[PDB]
Design a protein around this nucleic acid. Structure first.
Ligand SMILES: Nc1ncnc2c1ncn2[C@H]1C[C@H](O)[C@@H](COP(=O)(O)NP(=O)(O)OP(=O)(O)O)O1
Ligand SMILES: [Mg+2]
Ligand SMILES: [Mg+2]
Lengths: 51, 55, 51, 426
DNA sequence: GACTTGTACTGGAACTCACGTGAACGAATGTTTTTAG
DNA sequence: CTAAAAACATTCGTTCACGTGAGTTCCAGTACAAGTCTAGTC
């Protein structure tokens, strides 16, 4: 269990309460693939640069 | 480096025999001054495998 | 208990599983049985659930 | 190349192969001369996402394999290359692109005369003031700081010459600041002018009067030497002897008195027994021209002979008519107050008897300074794990003494360079 | 006072989760142009 | 002329890569307490 967000429900400009948002149903996704070095099968860092 | 019979090679080994498993085969082929690749590639000369597993 | 205490990550649960087919292991002896009861009580008071 | 006077080289470790190729192609399209491999022709080198130090490490490793006389290329950052490419010509280079003092005193020699007399004196005064309050740790650390200052090869004039020196914390550093920047330090002068310091120093100079007794007298209302003589009933024999001859013992002892005392003592030692040897230890053995007492060590070449020499020599000297006070009026140590001809003067003399096997150990224990001896003992017990005292060196693990036939063996077996007595001045 | 050892506290970074944005490939369908019968 | 084969255009779903806010917790860093400081004789 983990609240998606602790948000502020405002019935007015002064009447305010705190609520928590949860996802009782969430799409199940396959684990994210990772990149490995073919020669020796180790993780490889991914870096993006703009020039 | 007992002898030079492979020179440059990209040997791939997946499943060795019980008598000489992968740990005892990788260094054995490396002793001939070759290259070991855990997965096959375009340069790989051949892929060595014993028991026919899923891979 | 020593194995449980060795780890450092916070434990939400501490469970022990006893796979055996000996209803009365310490039948001939009695002091060993009492030591077992005392150790089980200590573990239960510590917060370890044995099944 | 259109720029014969400019040569550039790139670096693989951090720049990357793709960036290498892109930059090389762009520079070549812009006419710059880019070298595929490092060579003596290279004049400048570009390093990206790297610290200067590593760059130097990169250059030296490359320079070690180059012929002598080659001018090293200038180390620059990728910013220079980017600016040159943007402007189309080489942009001018600017600034952006472009064991020691061991803690233990047993390792650093301390000559008798140094170039930090004022600072050492101030630190010693602070140590004495701290000791007067019963805080032995403060006295020890201040003495260690003073010794560290004494061993400085060159005079200290700038604060920056205080970081690497050990045993130099906030208090000592602040005292050195006050001394160097202005002159007379506020704390040093304040403690010196304190009447408690003066009275305690005066009392301590009395033979047989220690810090505890001086403090007790302070709390009892005796603020000057006269009150001590007013009531000569609470003073023990040592204190009475010290006060009776206070003036004579206050004057420093000169080398002439040392030679006279040695000449007198040699005859007494011979009369007590022939073939005995006497060695002068203490401050005088270190080269000092002044002191408070003459320290002697008596030994015999044979092993079992050195049994009862000291009582015999003491009795012979007493028969001479020179002893004014004797520690005891079997023993192997005694400090007295000789009556040397002058009129006459009172000079403190210390005699010690040790066997030939333990002779080097006692000689080392008595020659070196108090602080030096303390530091050497601490180093022996902590680093090497051996117990060192005036009698011998002991190994707790192997219950066997590690005696030696020469004093230098003590330093040799402790993994320390040899020092002479003159350099053991704290 | 300076150093060393041991214990306790704590804010930042690593990890995970979830969402949004943008780019690329292939499937399926529809539509247009060109060429052999 | 004719239909049909090829080529072209569109929309959708899936995959992936990156960026970013929020919750949890693990640990390096900091702070603080306690011990040490030489060895012996008399
Ligand atoms: N607390 C101590 N711990 C270890 N050794 C000590 C010591 N006190 C003295 N010694 C050892 C080392 C000392 O070198 C030796 C001489 O003792 P002194 O005559 O009391 N002091 P010195 O001769 O250095 O100064 P001066 O010439 O003014 O007399 O005894
Ligand atoms: Mg002396
Ligand atoms: Mg003396």
């Amino acid at each position: 269990k983990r609240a998606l967000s602790r948000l502020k429900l405002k019935l007015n400009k002064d009447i305010v309460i705190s609520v928590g948002i949860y996802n009782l149903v969430q799409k199940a996704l396959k684990p994210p693939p990772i990149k490995l070095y073919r020669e020796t099968n180790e993780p490889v860092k991914t870096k993006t640069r703009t020039f | 480096k007992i002898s030079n019979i492979f020179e440059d090679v990209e040997f791939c080994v997946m499943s060795g025999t019980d008598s000489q498993p992968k740990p005892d085969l990788e260094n054995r082929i490396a002793e001939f001054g070759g290259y070991i690749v855990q997965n096959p590639g375009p340069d790989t000369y051949c892929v060595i495998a014993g028991s026919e597993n899923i891979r | 208990a020593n194995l449980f205490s060795d780890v450092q990550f916070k434990m939400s649960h501490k469970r022990i599983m006893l796979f055996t087919n000996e209803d009365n292991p310490h039948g001939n002896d009695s002091a060993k049985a009492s030591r077992a009861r005392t150790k089980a009580g200590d573990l239960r008071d510590t917060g370890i659930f044995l099944d | 190349t259109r720029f014969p006077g400019v040569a550039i080289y790139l670096v693989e470790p951090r720049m990357g192969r793709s960036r290498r190729a892109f930059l090389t192609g762009l520079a070549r399209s812009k006419g710059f001369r880019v070298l595929d491999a490092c060579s003596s022709e290279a004049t400048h080198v570009v390093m990206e996402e790297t610290s200067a130090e590593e760059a130097v490490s990169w250059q030296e490793r490359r320079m070690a394999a180059a012929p002598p006389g080659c001018t090293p290329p200038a180390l620059l950052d990728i910013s220079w290359l980017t600016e040159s490419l943007g402007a189309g010509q080489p942009v001018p280079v600017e600034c952006r692109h472009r064991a020691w003092m061991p803690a233990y005193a047993c390792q650093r020699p301390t000559p008798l005369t140094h170039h930090n007399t004022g600072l050492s004196e101030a630190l010693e005064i602070l140590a004495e003031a701290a000791g007067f309050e019963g805080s032995e740790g403060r006295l020890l650390t201040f003495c260690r700081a003073a010794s560290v200052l004494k061993a400085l090869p060159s005079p200290v004039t700038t604060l920056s010459q205080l970081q690497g020196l050990p045993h130099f914390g906030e208090h000592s550093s602040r005292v050195v600041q006050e001394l160097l920047e202005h002159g007379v330090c506020e704390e040093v002068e304040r403690v010196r002018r304190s009447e408690r310091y003066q009275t305690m120093k005066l009392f301590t100079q009395i033979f047989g009067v220690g810090v505890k007794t001086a403090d007790r007298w302070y709390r009892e209302g005796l603020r000057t030497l006269d009150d001590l003589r007013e009531q000569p009933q609470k003073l023990t024999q040592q204190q009475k002897a010290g006060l009776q001859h206070h003036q004579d013992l206050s004057t420093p002892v000169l080398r002439s008195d040392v030679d006279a005392l040695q000449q007198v003592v040699e005859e007494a030692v011979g009369q007590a027994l022939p073939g005995a040897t006497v060695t002068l230890t203490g401050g005088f053995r270190r080269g000092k021209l002044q002191g408070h007492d003459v320290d002697f060590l008596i030994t015999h070449p044979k092993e079992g002979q050195e049994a009862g020499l000291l009582p015999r020599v003491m009795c012979r000297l007493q028969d001479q008519g020179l002893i004014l006070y004797h520690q005891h009026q079997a023993f192997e140590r005694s400090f007295c107050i000789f009556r040397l001809p002058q009129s006459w003067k009172a000079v403190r003399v210390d005699l010690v008897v040790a066997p030939v096997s333990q002779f080097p150990f006692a000689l080392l224990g008595w020659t070196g300074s108090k602080l030096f001896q303390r530091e050497l003992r601490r180093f022996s017990r902590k680093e090497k794990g051996l117990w060192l005292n005036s009698h011998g060196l002991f190994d707790p693990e192997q219950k066997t003494f590690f005696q030696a036939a020469s004093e230098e063996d003590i330093f040799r077996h402790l993994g320390l360079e040899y020092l002479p007595p003159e350099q053991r001045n704290a």
